[model samples]
Target chain A: MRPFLIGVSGGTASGKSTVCEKIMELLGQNEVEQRQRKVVILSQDRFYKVLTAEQKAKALKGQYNFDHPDAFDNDLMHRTLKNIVEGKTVEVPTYDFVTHSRLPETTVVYPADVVLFEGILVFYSQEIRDMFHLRLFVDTDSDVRLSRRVLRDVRDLEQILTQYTTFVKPAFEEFCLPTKKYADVIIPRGVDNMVAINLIVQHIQDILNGDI
Target chain B: MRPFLIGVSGGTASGKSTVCEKIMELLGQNEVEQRQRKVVILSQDRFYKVLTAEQKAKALKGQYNFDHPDAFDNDLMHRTLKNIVEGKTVEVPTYDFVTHSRLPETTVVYPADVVLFEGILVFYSQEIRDMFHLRLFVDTDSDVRLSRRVLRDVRDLEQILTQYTTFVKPAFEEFCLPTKKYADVIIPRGVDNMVAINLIVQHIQDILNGDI
Candidate 1:
């Protein structure tokens, strides 16, 4: 494929999405003709596996570990992303967090010069990790990340803390932290780091311009 | 020396000063006490050698190549900067561009933890270049740099173009461009590049924090 693939991985609430957003913003989304945008963000969250019938009841009861790497359908994700990377127009599945299932409709993503794969566990699988041409890790203080996570959700503080301790924190320590050393660039302080975002985009721009 | 010395260089009006200013702004000026600033900017422009009596007449008549590496008193510059880098308080000379002479009074610069040495021909001398712990080149397109040069000065545009073609452009091609390979980082688009500035500061900050 001719596209430059970038993988952005970070902990929950570490601002990976914002970094991706600002990059596309600075790159100035260009449409060659019609709806063919030159840049696209393929969120790993969209690959959440459809829960089993019994698992749905447990997930609604807050007894399921949604934060676990097993919660994602990586096999399906690999096939879809691999096809997309091979320059095919892939119909990506849309996932619903609240409903705990993939949506009825699929999103058709066209081929692009830049593809940003962003998520908390994007670097978990070596196969998925190897597909990315550039890898970046967003590093934020644990307390800062926790504070943002706590404030963003409107649920009870005690229940939130329980989920965080039980799944989120555990998953991050085991799955996320180890993958950091694999990143080509480590961005400290997340999206507030305008400098990191700007430099990252310039490299991507260079790739698109054939300056690499 | 306890200080981290940074050298910033680029073509005329390439925003070298602006980059230095923003770095200090971001790193933040901590007084510690009355007049003891933690960071100081030591501009290479202040080291312009006083022209000889006969040379003064030629300089006033626009026959002087002020942009040349020979225009600076490197011996005095080396001594002053060497002392400053060794963490000593020094009396820095002041230059009068119009009169082509040094001012009667000197400016006292206190010893600082971070010293930013910025100028167009800063990288021209290897002795001066070697003193810097970190070297950065401000890279703006020749056309963009020229446009800014045209807009900033109130002199006749024709005269400006003459000076540019005679001294500035030639000096950059010969003296400035070759030194780019020596720089640790190349900041494209000058001060407009907030990301490059921010990232550079972070590295400096890391140095200060003993993370290096």
Candidate 2:
């Protein structure tokens, strides 16, 4: 049977990682000997286009718009997801956020019962969006996310203010928020809302049992 | 049949009202001639104990702890909810925030397939918590809720700061927040998270249809 595909999308620091982590914990990893492999999480961050020297310089200066849809290598993401859904093993790329470039090594991921694809722009492309059986959008307040990003990125107040106003906020409204309409589920407060997460787990379980 | 009791709790202006309003809108009201009534909402605000003249004086001075569990008339609330769940009509009391007292007029509410009970302290009492088949906690950032409350309460910046620090924040930490452990579902972005809301609606429908 084709593996169940779940796409989780959200803005920067919106707890997308937390949601995916919780799912991974609940689903368990293939590395665990006692449990059968049930789920694999793929991050859209890994699909960021390998920036050239010039582009990398611009990215360091905060000129490159990483939040934009154009920043992603959608072709590779689509092919990899398609392969996984069709029960093929694929080598997933790894990217460095600090350097804004793909790493030389890749992780081999085998197809499983469920494939959880997470990122800020996972739902941006129509072709890729159509491949998922379930789509989840993690919605968090812009202010909440801004504070989180500030902490994570370790930028000064002025730099944080400039980056958010110039790139992050606009890109989210233009790209990320629009895809919310495509989601089958929206997790508000991301991973902190255990009730929503439990319901989602139950729904997925029901699907696995062919009860839905 | 006993109505499907849903307890919605949140801090002031955390979108508990908005969630209830959307559920009511989706479920349709008895006022709509073409739709069969399937839901009724009851607010815990209406069950605030009648304050004496001295307490009213303290309230205006912002010395009264409105957010405290002791401020609510849980006995009346418990009795009324019991009657509603047992398939009897109830006269829900009305309260005026401006004057801080229960109004003489009462709203007559009939039992239905669903009962959405919303308030900051809905889950404060163990008896009330046990009565709910579904418990939802609306979680919003303190900053977001503060801003919303500032607008709703028409308080100046200084007053907002003073009141929140003095009364609201302390009470929430002491009483309202501790009850979060009891919730079955916790909504992060409140009413704006349509994906979460839709899933909740779907769950309710499944329960009503005997599919769960």
Candidate 3:
């Protein structure tokens, strides 16, 4: 069976991670083996393109626009996702957020019954967006998201704030927000919308059971 | 708190009742008093206008177009929903599908934490469609729906078939189907889409809990 693909998009600190975790948690995770799991999360974060030396220098000062569409490797992401959807056991890379590059190590992801691909720009590219059978957008308050962003990564408060206002938030407005029209379900208030999550999980189960 | 309003639109025999029942069931039903219930279901069937004598005769012969937008009392629906949203208790009329008119007795529906308004034409009117905090469209195969309709209201299959082909099916195509664009979530395979239901319930729970 083709693995069901769900594309989840949102702004920075919109609780995309939490939403994915909650969905996986509700789907059950006591599988004897990792390959035996029914659901797997494939993050677009893992497909951050390798930055040039000049880009790395700018990134250290929080000047690089990591949230931009050009920051991701769609060709790689599209290839991996298509293979995974075709029931192929594929090896995906691990991204280094600090270095803004791909790590040497790779993670093997088995084709599961369902796959949730989440990121700020998951729906930015039509090729990638069209692959999703279901699309979900997590909508949250900008102030709340900014606060949560500060809370999560505060090693360099000044750099974080600079990056957010200059690149992160602006990129979200220009590149990410408009893509919400592509979403089938817009989850207001992010992870706290448990009602939306429950309904999503039930829908996935029904599809896997061939009930739909 | 303002009661959350959900608009559910679906074709006849797409299992709208089953979907509503499942939602109510999952939301839990224990309440010390009728007014104390956290959730209430407001059916669109209740707002169906009393038919004229000539219309009643056509309806008896399975000639009237119950599926058309003109068949419903949107004015009354709008008033009832507005009142319910403002936390007022309402004495709603009972709709008798048999006589195609309102019954003399009334059912008192209290303003609860949430109210689900479901029917074929829930999304037909711009005013009525705009009231829903959440909109769900149940999409099902027409063949399966026809089979279910025959099973449920099958005193005469020939009349049912005639009514469905002449009015019901055409009205659904022209009136009901286009409204799917208004839906935030398009639930394919009708009541079998349990995942959609689960997520919807979880979202409602989050809202009621003030988690969102």
Per-model root-mean-square deviation over C-alphas: 19.3, 8.6, 11.9
Q: TM-score of model 2, chain A?
A: 0.91
Runs off by more than 4 Å, candidate 1: A30-34, B1-212
Q: Alpha carbon lDDT of residue B191, candidate 2?
A: 82
Candidate 2 chain B: worst-modelled 10 consecutive residues by lDDT: B27-36
TM-score result, candidate 1: 0.53
Best prediction by DockQ: 2
Winning model by lDDT: 3
Per-residue lDDT tens digits of candidate 3, residues A88-136? 9999999988767888889988878889889999998898888887788
Comparing to the true complex, what docking class would candidate 2 get? incorrect
lDDT of 1 by residue, A1-212 (tens): 47778898888889888889888878787333414688888889999989899999987667788778898988978998898789888888898877999999998889888899999888888999999877777777788999998998764788778878887888889888888756655666677777567667756765676654
Chain B TM-score, all predictions listed = 0.92, 0.92, 0.94
Question: Distance from true position, residue A202, model 2, in Å?
Answer: 6.7
Give per-residue CA lDDT, model 1, range B5-95, as digits (tens).
8888888788888889888888776334415677788888899998999889887666788788898888888999889888788888899
- TM-score, every prediction: 0.53, 0.60, 0.58
DockQ pick, better of 2 and 3: 2
Docking class of 1: incorrect
- Which parts of model 3 have CA positions greater than 4 angstroms off? A30-32, B1-91, B94-212
Candidate 3 lDDT over B65-88, as tens digits, reads: 888889988888899888998889
Which candidate number has the best TM-score?
A: 2
The residue pairs that clash in candidate 1, if any, are A195-B195
User: Each candidate: what lDDT?
Assistant: 0.80, 0.80, 0.82
lDDT of 3 at B78: 90
